């Protein structure tokens, strides 16, 4: 029974209930993420930016079932084209706008990865992806506004692949946390 999360803390409690089992009701998880109205005071602790690239800030470890984290995107910061390691990936905007570009899985043959579609994700919107859907790139193309997003991955993963847009070739990447539970983790 899904109720509106009143606060980020409330959201986290609700997520623990929704991931208490072995499976994931994606539509319910997306609905509750969308229903949380971003309150910057509640996540300022996690919103640690870097001048040169986007940062990943761990918020909750989900009792082992998921990682919940906040990503902070300076102006012009963006991601690789990447997958999600056979996991569920939810993305909710907390501040600003991000451009999500969708790509298909490349064929064995070397070829330009042509974008399938793109959308602008706006404050409080929640997107979902998984490997059966495809790949994506996420970018803050703003020249004037930093962006902040809330990501939920289930099961947790700390490795993924980056794809070369020119060829489709992939390379394994290990993701690091800029901070955990509000604490910078150099
Ligand atoms: N999965 C990426 C961000 C876009 S979903 C990450 O954690 O760096
Ligand atoms: Fe992603």
UniProtKB/Swiss-Prot annotation:
Gene Ontology MF terms: cysteine dioxygenase activity; ferrous iron binding; nickel cation binding; zinc ion binding
A GO CC term assigned to this protein in UniProt: cytosol
Required cofactor(s): Fe cation; Ni(2+); Zn(2+)
Residues reported in the UniProt entry to bind Fe cation: 82, 84, 136
3'-(S-cysteinyl)-tyrosine (Cys-Tyr) cross-link, renumbered residues: 89-153
Cofactor note: Binds 1 Fe cation per subunit. Ni(2+) and Zn(2+) can be used to a lesser extent.
Induction: By increase of sulfur amino acid intake.
Gene3D superfamilies linked: Jelly Rolls
Tissue: Highest levels in liver. Significant expression also in kidney, lung and brain.
InterPro entries xref list: CDO_1, RmlC-like_jellyroll, RmlC_Cupin_sf
Entry EC number(s): 1.13.11.20
Family: Belongs to the cysteine dioxygenase family.
Assembly mode: Monomer.
Name of the protein in its database record: Cysteine dioxygenase type 1
Lineage summary: Eukaryota, Metazoa, Chordata, Craniata, Vertebrata
Gene that produces this protein: Cdo1
């Amino acid at each position: 029974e899904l109720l509106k999360p009143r606060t980020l803390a409330d959201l986290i409690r609700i997520l623990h209930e929704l991931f208490a089992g072995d499976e994931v009701n994606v539509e319910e998880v997306q609905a509750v993420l969308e229903a949380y109205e971003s309150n910057p005071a509640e996540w300022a602790l996690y919103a640690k930016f870097d001048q040169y690239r986007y940062t990943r800030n761990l918020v909750d470890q989900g009792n082992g079932k998921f990682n919940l984290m906040i990503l902070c995107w300076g102006e012009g910061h963006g991601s690789s084209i990447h997958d999600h390691t056979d996991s569920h990936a939810f993305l909710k905007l907390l501040q600003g706008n991000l451009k999500e570009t969708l790509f298909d899985w490349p064929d064995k043959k070397s070829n330009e990865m042509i974008k399938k579609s793109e959308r602008t994700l706006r404050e409080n919107q929640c997107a979902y992806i998984n490997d059966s859907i495809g790949l994506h790139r996420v970018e803050n193309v703003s020249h004037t506004e930093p962006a902040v997003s809330l990501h939920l991955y289930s099961p947790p993963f700390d490795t993924c692949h980056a794809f070369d847009q020119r060829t489709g070739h992939k390379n394994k990447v290990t993701m690091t946390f800029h901070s955990k539970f509000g604490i910078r983790t150099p």
